[PDB]
């Protein structure tokens, strides 16, 4: 029966490939060959954030587009005021091996996680003046790679045990476990309607999930190496990847295949962090060769280089109003660009 | 600037002062990473300096504080989190001398020695550990002494053609670990043989990290 099941799986894969190639009638490069190029977008370091003592591994913006959280291997979780270069908080962590951080949309909680296999939720708004651990979520066998907040009570996590999980912070228990990835799941991104999320893993695949149903809807296999970064389009009907094969790729959920590849022959390094702008025209990808690059999303042409970091940039994000990009690197420096 | 913004700047300065004094307190600590196979005597070493994830072992010896880190609970891909340990002072590698035949849990692998050399190739020639020194513990030497007479060393390596005494075979094993890094000028490999009853291994780690600290200070003074 194993041979019959393998033949059925190969037949279904051939059917999926034929249905994907049937919809392919015109590439995105052909249809956007008439739109005007964006130009020569040049940004400058408006602010630099100092105070970290080790490599910064993750950062996340706030909904207010002013507050910034950061995580580093010195066991610190600093909440920054980006406008005035001020330190609102400095949260010591029980485990210094942090790999991810998140900031709640309401601004009341932050999260962190890493090699301690625990997502820790920290309460910022307390009657006492300190920041305390509201909940320690345990249940992942592998290293926690990404965490993102849906609301004040739900947080979705990606881990190194080839599973993604959705938690309930008040109960501190699993709600839905997402299974189907073969390799280590590395990055998460959440749709603006907070009902779907895409996870990129080390099996060179990205899977689209349903939060309320807990099933994988679509699987996107175009890469050749470990996917490290992921982000939706602002529309929610597309997303962009980033892997160690020096290639960013854009996928559409409705077209169910790849639309545009972002690679130059002079770039041989991994990609750590990928983000979009507010309009989605301007794709930003952070690389391992100590600088960020700016890509035009509708036509794969490099329109800028953000070069201000001594070591490799590991995390970057764009504010919700689109007024600033904050790149974080391994030289313990956060820089805000405009 | 407002009064509240001035007080926020003062709060930020207090936070900076606390971070700086925490750095001053933690500058004297030495971070170490312990790596090894399954039954390689990792438990006999952690007991000798003193889904879970990391295990941190803390111990002190003569005005130095050490923080060993065990990554044996992480069964995922090692290449996706080994960059966290790029700034460690040393790597303690534990390999068993009693691995003449010693097939693995798979029960078709050749030797535990070959897996140990494969892990040594993965660690010493890694991209993030180009200049990080290694402390190499060749433990379970009692079983090695009671096992060299019964079984010759040719059952593991079919190139020995030498006497099966304790000293010569142990030196052959140690030298086959040592001639395996192609960065012999920058990093150094310190070797020891542990009988699981010795009480001087902590002194060996202390001496090795003193060597590494002095060599790093000499290097970033530009002396070499």
């Amino acid at each position, epitope marked *: 029966e194993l041979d019959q099941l393998r033949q059925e799986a190969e037949q279904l894969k051939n059917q999926i490939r034929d249905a994907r190639k049937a919809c392919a009638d015109a590439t995105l490069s052909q249809i956007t060959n008439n739109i005007d190029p964006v130009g020569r977008i040049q940004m400058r370091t408006r602010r630099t954030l100092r105070g970290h003592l080790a490599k910064i591994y993750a950062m996340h913006w706030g909904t207010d587009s002013r507050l910034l959280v950061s995580a580093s291997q010195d066991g610190k979780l600093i909440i920054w*005021d980006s406008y005035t270069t001020n330190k609102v908080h400095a949260i010591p962590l029980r485990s210094s091996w942090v790999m991810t951080c998140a900031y709640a949309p309401s601004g009341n909680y932050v999260a962190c996680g890493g090699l301690d296999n625990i997502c820790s939720i920290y309460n910022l*708004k307390t009657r006492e003046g300190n920041v305390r651990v509201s909940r320690e979520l345990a249940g992942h066998t592998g290293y926690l790679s990404c965490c993102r907040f849906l609301d004040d009570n739900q947080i979705v996590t990606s881990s190194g045990d080839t599973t993604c999980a959705l938690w309930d912070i008040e109960t501190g228990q699993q709600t839905t476990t997402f299974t189907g990835h073969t390799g280590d799941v590395m990055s998460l991104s959440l749709a603006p309607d907070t009902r779907l999320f895409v996870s990129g893993a080390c099996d060179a695949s990205a899977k689209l999930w349903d939060v309320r149903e807990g099933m994988c809807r679509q699987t996107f296999t175009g890469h050749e190496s470990d996917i490290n970064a992921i982000c939706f389009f602002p529309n929610g009907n597309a997303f962009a990847t980033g892997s160690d094969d020096a290639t960013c790729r854009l996928f559409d959920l409705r077209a169910d295949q790849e639309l545009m590849t972002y690679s130059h022959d002079n770039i041989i390094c991994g990609i750590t962090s990928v983000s979009f702008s507010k309009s989605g025209r301007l794709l930003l990808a952070g690389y391992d060769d100590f600088n960020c690059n700016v890509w035009d999303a509708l036509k794969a042409d490099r329109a800028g280089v953000l070069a201000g970091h001594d070591n490799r940039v590991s995390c970057l994000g764009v504010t919700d109003d689109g007024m600033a990009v904050a790149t974080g690197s391994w030289d313990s420096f956060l820089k805000i660009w405009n | 600037v407002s009064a509240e913004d001035k007080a926020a700047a003062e709060r930020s300065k207090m936070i900076d002062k606390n971070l700086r004094e925490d750095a001053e307190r933690d500058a004297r600590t030495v971070k170490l990473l312990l790596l090894g196979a399954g039954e390689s005597g990792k438990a006999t070493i952690v007991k000798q300096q003193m889904t879970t994830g990391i295990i941190e072992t803390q111990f002190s010896f003569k005005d130095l504080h050490f923080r060993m880190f065990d990554v044996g609970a992480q069964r995922s891909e090692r290449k996706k989190w080994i960059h966290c340990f790029e700034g460690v002072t040393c790597i303690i590698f534990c390999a068993a001398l009693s691995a003449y035949d010693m097939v693995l849990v798979e029960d078709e692998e050749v030797n535990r020695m070959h897996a140990s050399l494969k892990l040594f190739d993965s660690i010493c020639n890694h991209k993030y550990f180009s200049d990080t020194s290694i402390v190499l513990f060749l433990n379970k030497k009692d079983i090695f002494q009671e096992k060299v007479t019964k079984v010759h060393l040719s059952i593991c390596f079919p190139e020995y053609t030498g006497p099966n005494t304790f000293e010569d075979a142990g030196n052959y094993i140690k030298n086959q670990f040592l001639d395996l890094n192609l960065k012999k000028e920058d990093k150094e490999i310190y070797s020891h043989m542990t009988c699981s009853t010795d009480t001087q291994n902590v002194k060996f780690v202390f001496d090795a990290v003193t060597d590494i600290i002095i060599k790093e200070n000499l290097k970033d003074c530009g002396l070499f």
Partner: single-chain antibody
Amino acid sequence: VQLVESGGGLVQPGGSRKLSCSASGFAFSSFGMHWVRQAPEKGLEWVAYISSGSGTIYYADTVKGRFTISRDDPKNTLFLQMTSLRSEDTAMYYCVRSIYYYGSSPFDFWGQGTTLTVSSSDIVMTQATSSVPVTPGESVSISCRSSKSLLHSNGNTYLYWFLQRPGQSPQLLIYRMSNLASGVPDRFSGSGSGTAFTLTISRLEAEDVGVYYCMQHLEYPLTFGAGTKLEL
């Protein structure tokens, strides 16, 4: 959160007295502390302020030189050393905690206070209304005015609203304009622009009867205003 003050009593003129406040239930080392006076037939007056780390000390013009404010962070105690007491220092002295970061809520908690008795420019905040009659279930607007425009260049208007219930310590309602404090029911609202200010109560109850005080935090020495009273 508890802030209990100690001291008080009948002090002769020209003498000395020390007021000590004990803080329990919060991180005392991360809070800047204040002292606020209240004469028996007058309003609220600001005395002194000590910051976290004791790096910034401020005094009012009336009590400069005579008064010294200090803290002991391991003992969780706040002190106010008073020398050469006149008959204008007869007041109940409140200890107020204040924390300052982006989005913080200064003047959030107020102590019970100790009564002191002695025998024998500045931004003027004006509240022209005083003792207006109220009826439960109605809407009451309390107006506030300032000599200097409190809207800073960063877009923050530093106008603070307080409620003094009869026989009780003051409580914070609105810290910056249209910023409701924690625990305040969501019927109080604040609005204004520059000089003019308003405080609107949607459907007032018997617990909203009291004296409502203005305060500015644009610059020291933190002038209050003569409060407006609500009476049934």
